[PDB]
């Protein structure tokens with residue numbers, strides 16, 4: 001089978017067939033829960049190892065804290081989306097316990113106990129875990145699940161300056177995970193006061209955007225918590241002159257959401273298209289079997305010494321047409337066809353997945369040439385998704401064009417006053433008129449200028465502080 | 475602070491002090507749940523990566539299935555020990571859902587759907603996860619916890635031969651994790667009918683033993699499930715001539731218990747002793763000059779060795795010596811003026827207290843080599859202690875005396891279920907219970923075919939079996 005829904009006009013059906021026929025996902029009989037079959041789980045394992053290697057270079061250490069937390073401890077800080085354990089076997093528990101929705105209330109009482117002097121700082125912890133949250137919005141594979149996988153990092157420092165720089169380091173690593181690994185463009189910025197994590201001072205984030213349906217997605221985040229939680233839990237150290245001070249904290253997380261943004265970004269009407277740095281198989285060799293079976297395996301050896309993941313499909317019970325569609329659906333980058341005249345010429349017929357480009361390549365040039373085609377594919381995918389991200393951002397300086405452009409499926413960049421009240425009104429109005437539009441982020445990179453004391457909010461009557469990105473959110 | 479309990483006369487207090495002062499573990503306020511701080515989590519990560527690479531050579535693929543299961547699906551195949559979610563926020567759920575205690579009932583309905591033809595076999599799946607089980611027995615860190623981490627492997631094959639080959643391959647990799655990585659001796663064998671996993675036909679395992687308290691522990695396990703589960707869930711394939719048959723299944727798992735067994739095996743009255751293949755830090759460099767410390771260091775990183783300097787002014791050399799000893803660092807380098815003058819390092823070796831002077835010029839070559847020697851020494855001594863703890867008995871008479879010397883018993887046995895049941899009752903009354911641990915693969919001792927009798931029952935013995943008190 002092939003894909004029978006169109007990406008642009010039947011997106012939901014398209015996304016569903018693509019993740020099921022590729023064997024990325026299976027649907028389960030508890031709503032919002034999804035099985036990650038090997039084909040998608042390989043992508044998560046790759047993300048794990050690249051990010052892990054990065055944080056190790058800034059001395060983050062891995063640990064594992066428990067999945068349960070008591071209500072006493074959870075209700076020190078959100079509650080209707082928490083799952084509670086009340087029973088073991090048939091008999092009621094004397095008091096209920098919560099499955100972990102995040103680890104602050106599990107971890108921080110122990111930070112208080114371990115930290116006594118500036119010499120115990122910095123303290124940098126990370127754990128890879130699963131998380132449960134009882135979502136009220138409708139679920140969607142990867143993007144919004146009841147159980148998801150993530151890492152959560154939690155640091156403590158002696159100055160604000162050192163904590164803020166760790167916030168920024170992590171935010172850059174996250175951007176690199178999306179751009180360099182997943183070939184998915186993202187926009188770095190700061191969250192408005194209405195949209196930030198309420199238990200912290202600042203929240204930075206990366207935003208991405210699915211152009212076929214007009215919706216922004218928050219792709220990862222990184223908080224300067226400051227002294228908010230350190231006062232709340234008693235996290236304090238003796239400085240050099242004997243004086244107790246409250247530590248300056250950060251936290252940050254990234255989830256399997258990443259995998260879904262990537263699929264929705266690169267996929268087409270024939271199936272998955274995958275970045276070669278995360279594709280479980282990059283090259284599949286299909287012979288049209290006598291001296292064929294010797295040339296196939298020579299080609300395999302060559303690619304394997306070179307570091308390329310390659311398989312041969314030499315099954316007798318399938319048409320070459322069937323095979324072509326099977327590996328296309330699974331997003332294999334390169335497809336080598338090997339028949340009689342390919343043997344006769346000592347060369348391989350190549351078809352490139354994302355563009356349908358055909359090429360013949362002598363065998364003695366494979367060692368050099370294939371690694372280099374894979375680097376080109378990786379760069380072409382990021383370059384195209386970025387151009388489409390740019391086509392989707394429209395500058396507006398007043399309210400009158402907004403609704404026209406949200407209905408073309410776009411994001412808005414607009415000068416803005418950043419007040420909470422202003423944001424709440426924008427929301428009410430856009431909803432009424434359509435569905436609501438919210439602030440996504442204030443981009444770190446301001447490609448457009450504020451004339452000092454002349455430029456107005458695009459909505460309120462006040463003066464603008466900066467330009468800000470707005471749109472409808474997944 | 476150092477260790478103020480004796481391993482032999484105060485084992486419980488000893489084990490607790492060692493894992494807390496080492497900074498491996500922190501106690502938490504829900505019983506049976508323990509935090510794994512980086513010093514112990516590093517050892518789990520190492521286990522993960524070594525086992526992962528091995529199973530990949532036999533084509534096992536990793537996946538991740540959900541944590542929840544419906545009571546409908548769970549009660550197709552152990553009731554009082556499962557944890558139930560009944561509420562989100564303040565509102566009751568329509569129906570309760572179980573946190574995963576094992577994954578058969580989560581995985582196998584999907585195996586039934588994916589498997590149609592012999593061309594879809596073998597199917598080989600592994601997942602790394604956490605598990606919850608509401609234990610009734612008293613908890614102990616690593617050994618028996620409410621939440622634990624593990625891998626669970628689940629396979630399906632078109633013949634029993636191939637499924638059994640896979641059971642044995644896994645059992646050998648588990649033996650190798652304990653022996654080659656953790657320097658901890660284990661005994662391979664087959665579980666008795668009374669002790670095997672009821673859902674399957676055969677269960678193999680490795681058993682460890684802690685000589686200081688006289689108790690066996692089951693270290694990992696591996697089942698030939700045969701066709702029992704395939705019939706229960708409908709896992710069938712068509713052969714080459716169109717005939718439907720039920721697939722032949724295996725499963726196997728290993729948990730964070732491994733870390734506990736290793737700790738209890740090698741640790742002494744000064745603290746952790748760690749196999750160098752899993753020590754988070756292998757060499758600590760302590761100065762009593764700084765160009766010379768950083769030189770030794772560089773030499774050791776190019777060589778592939780995990781090394782740190784402790785150059786803190788506010789602590790005495792004797793405080794540092796204890797600190798890194800408690801934490802089980804293999805090799806301690808002392809660098810004073812005397813040492814600096816001679817272009818040599820004073821070395822102190824953690825398990826034997828042995829002292830050496832090594833020239834800086836010889837470090838590239840000689841430190842790896844010490845670390846291999848230390849790794850082998852640890853396994854060698856634990857093996858000798860395992861042998862002293864195993865006594866041949868041919869009748870019931872010396873059994874109790876032998877259990878009360880903190881030992882295991884190897885004995886001729888008939889292998890009946892009713893025989894084992896009675897052995898349990900009697901040894902309990904008389905002390906608590908002894909049960910069968912395994913029937914070793916390796917049968918040192920010989921059966922007189924026709925003449926040799928059960929040591930307890932009056933029937934004929936099938937072969938020699940290992941019995942003892944279990945953790």
Ligand SMILES: Nc1ncnc2c1ncn2[C@@H]1O[C@H](COP(=O)(O)OP(=O)(O)NP(=O)(O)O)[C@@H](O)[C@H]1O
Pocket residue numbers: 133135142143144145146148218219220221253254255256257
């Ligand atoms: N249900 C979910 N499924 C998958 N990923 C999620 C889910 N909820 C949040 N995420 C991701 O987790 C990252 C950080 O989590 P967190 O900041 O706690 O989320 P949040 O505040 O609830 N934001 P959001 O869930 O997007 O409204 C987010 O930036 C999302 O990319």
Ligand SMILES: Nc1ncnc2c1ncn2[C@@H]1O[C@H](COP(=O)(O)OP(=O)(O)NP(=O)(O)O)[C@@H](O)[C@H]1O
Pocket residue numbers: 607609616617618619620622692693694695727728729730731
């Ligand atoms: N509570 C626990 N905590 C940690 N590890 C455990 C626990 N229970 C079992 N294990 C380990 O998990 C492995 C797989 O065990 P499993 O198939 O569940 O058998 P079991 O009958 O539950 N074992 P046991 O707890 O010794 O009676 C065993 O070989 C044990 O080493």
Ligand SMILES: O=C(C[C@H]1NCCC[C@@H]1O)Cn1cnc2cc(Br)c(Cl)cc2c1=O
Pocket residue numbers: 078079080081082101102103133134151152153197221251252253
């Ligand atoms: O989860 C967070 C804040 C941060 N925690 C560390 C990892 C990165 C993450 O952004 C915000 N958050 C999000 N969702 C939640 C859902 C529930 Br239910 C609860 Cl109780 C609490 C929360 C809650 O605190």
Ligand SMILES: O=C(C[C@H]1NCCC[C@@H]1O)Cn1cnc2cc(Br)c(Cl)cc2c1=O
Pocket residue numbers: 552553554555556575576577578607608626627671695725726727
């Ligand atoms: O967990 C098992 C059998 C195997 N499952 C796959 C990994 C290896 C493991 O040995 C046996 N077992 C053990 N403990 C259990 C506890 C509960 Br509670 C339940 Cl419901 C079920 C079980 C249960 O089935």
Ligand SMILES: [Zn+2]
Pocket residue numbers: 416417418419422457458459460461462
């Ligand atoms: Zn305004």
Ligand SMILES: [Zn+2]
Pocket residue numbers: 887888889890893928929930931932933
């Ligand atoms: Zn008998």
